[PDB]
């Protein structure tokens, strides 16, 4: 967890869970970054705020 | 008393997936009851669970 007023600009692939997988995806880790699924035609929950 | 170290840390099985709790935190954590549901399915039906 990140403390209040703390900045991390690193975009690279790092440890996700409690077990470091040493860089490249594998060894029961996952890809940390995700993208928004925003669709204009769906309801309130998918609307950006 | 169930030993989850040889069940997880040994990596003797094919795969495992956790929800809401890390697999390394299950040694120091536990709940009231634990159940085991045994059934046989196909490979394409694994994602349906």
Which helix (H) or strand (E) segment holds residue B6: the answer is: helix B5-8
Query: Count of CB atoms within 10 A of residue A5's CB?
Result: 5
Inter-chain CB pairs, A–B, below 8 Å: 7
| Cβ <8 Å between B24 and A28 | no
d(CA A7, nearest CA chain B) in Å: 25
Distance of CA B8 to the CA centre of its chain: 8
Question: What is the resolution in angstroms?
Answer: 2.8
The 8 Å CB, 24+ separation contacts for A6-10 are none
Distance CA B15, CA A29 (A): 12
Chain B neighbors of A17, CB-CB under 8 A: 22
B10 touches A at CB < 8 Å: no
Method: cryo-EM
Distance CA A14, CA A38 (A): 26
Distance CA B36, CA B49 (A): 15
Which residues, at least 6 apart from A32, have a Cβ–Cβ distance to it below 8 Å?
A13, A14, A16
């Amino acid at each position: 967890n990140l403390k209040p007023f703390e900045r991390d600009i690193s975009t690279e692939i790092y440890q996700a869970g409690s077990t470091p997988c040493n860089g490249v995806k594998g060894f029961n880790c996952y890809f940390p970054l995700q993208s928004y699924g925003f669709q204009p035609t769906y309801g309130v929950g998918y609307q950006p705020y | 008393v169930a030993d989850y170290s040889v069940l997880y840390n040994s990596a003797s099985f094919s795969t495992f997936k956790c929800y809401g709790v890390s697999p390394t935190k299950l040694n120091d954590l536990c709940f009231t009851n634990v159940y085991a549901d045994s059934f046989v399915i196909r490979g394409d039906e694994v994602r349906q669970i």
